[PDB]
DNA sequence: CCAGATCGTGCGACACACCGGGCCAATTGGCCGATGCCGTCCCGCGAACCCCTCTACCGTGTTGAGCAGCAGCGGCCT
């Protein structure tokens, strides 16, 4: 808690590092597969 | 002295006083009935009016003064 919240948010967002193209593609594939599995679970 | 103003009195006219008759003028004022133009409304289409949606070279950091409470520290006490 500080009188300035912009600095707090800025310093908070930087903890997570960046990502590369292959990582992005792998994450997208994970999202797709997870949602399709969720739909399959929705099936009875 | 005696003669006109004032008034008494008299005769007439007479402008209406009555209270009652017998008709009339003017002037209606309603809408009667018939005819006609405007208000309202129900679409009809179209101009605009507002809302929602999407674009893939990429790109990764904003004074002074007065009064009171809290944090750090010196120094007993165990």
Is any atom of strand B within 7 angstroms of residue A25's beta carbon? no
Using CA atoms, how far apart are residues A23 and A13, in angstroms rounded to an integer? 19
Resolution (Å) of this entry: 3.2
Using CA atoms, how far apart are residues A42 and A44, in angstroms rounded to an integer? 6
Cα dist from A29 to A21, A22, A33, whole Å: 12, 11, 6
Give the method of determination: cryo-EM
Using CA atoms, how far apart are residues A7 and A27, in angstroms rounded to an integer? 30
Is any atom of strand B within 7 angstroms of residue A4's beta carbon? yes
DSSP state of A3: S
């Amino acid at each position: 808690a500080t009188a300035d919240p912009v600095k707090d948010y800025l310093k908070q967002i930087g903890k997570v590092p960046l990502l590369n193209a292959e990582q992005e593609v792998e994450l997208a594939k994970r999202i797709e597969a997870g949602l399709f599995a969720e739909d399959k679970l929705a099936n009875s």
